[PDB]
Amino acid sequence: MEARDKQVLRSLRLELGAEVLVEGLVLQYLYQEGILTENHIQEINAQTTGLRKTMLLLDILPSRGPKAFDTFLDSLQEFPWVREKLKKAREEAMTDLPAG
């Protein structure tokens, strides 16, 4: 049960985390919606480059954010390709019981 959203994060976390976005309204809808928090502020304000911001969510959701995904995706400045590949990892990254 408690390993579906966090599983997605980690997965696509490193994937798109390596390099995908460098700017675009995203964590703004989040930080506001609640996805984030003061704690994030520190991490998000920490980037110092641009690609970090992304890593951030991917770095926060896994620790600070139980149901921040659905919303963290609603931000996906590039959803068309980031959201798909994401929810894809929600279906894939999410440890499944079945097998075949």
Side-chain angles (χ1 to χ4, degrees):
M1 204 91 54
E2 171 133 279
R4 166 150 19 71
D5 244 12
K6 50 98 111 236
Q7 266 287 39
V8 207
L9 250 296
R10 228 261 231 288
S11 259
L12 268 262
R13 139 69 187 275
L14 82 112
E15 268 315 281
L16 44 57
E19 194 139 359
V20 73
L21 179 136
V22 63
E23 254 280 306
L25 252 107
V26 34
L27 328 112
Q28 289 242 50
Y29 133 49
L30 310 200
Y31 252 130
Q32 265 249 100
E33 242 325 328
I35 300 239
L36 324 199
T37 143
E38 293 149 1
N39 298 284
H40 290 218
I41 251 51
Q42 288 244 250
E43 284 228 286
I44 296 288
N45 302 8
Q47 2 149 203
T48 226
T49 67
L51 275 299
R52 236 271 157 69
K53 326 200 246 189
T54 318
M55 235 169 105
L56 241 271
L57 238 286
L58 316 170
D59 242 278
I60 354 182
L61 299 196
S63 284
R64 324 269 92 179
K67 305 265 232 192
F69 220 42
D70 301 344
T71 303
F72 138 76
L73 307 125
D74 254 62
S75 64
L76 274 174
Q77 220 259 326
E78 20 176 11
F79 343 70
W81 167 287
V82 300
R83 129 173 98 87
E84 314 223 0
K85 304 295 157 140
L86 243 192
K87 251 135 191 212
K88 120 209 204 150
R90 138 168 274 185
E91 275 257 303
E92 259 169 45
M94 189 258 171
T95 0
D96 315 73
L97 258 73

